[PDB]
Ligand binder design. Structure first.
Ligand code: ZN
Ligand code: ZN
Length: 59
């Protein structure tokens, strides 16, 4: 029972995903480090949050 303050849609049981703690969407992925915008339903979640593959892409 919460509202994804990313896109702006309330959710609790749908396309939401568990970011090891925080509720998100399969597109509302916001990197915990580079804060970059990460769309699409494909990324990674860890460290109690969710990180972007774009980070591990830089190296
Ligand atoms: Zn969202
Ligand atoms: Zn990142």
């Amino acid at each position: 029972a919460e509202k994804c303050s990313r896109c702006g849609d309330s959710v609790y049981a749908a396309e939401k995903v568990i970011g090891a703690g925080k509720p998100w969407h399969k597109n509302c992925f916001r990197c915990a480090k580079c804060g970059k915008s990460l769309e699409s339903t494909t990324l990674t979640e860890k460290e109690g949050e969710i990180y972007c593959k774009g980070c591990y892409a830089k190296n």
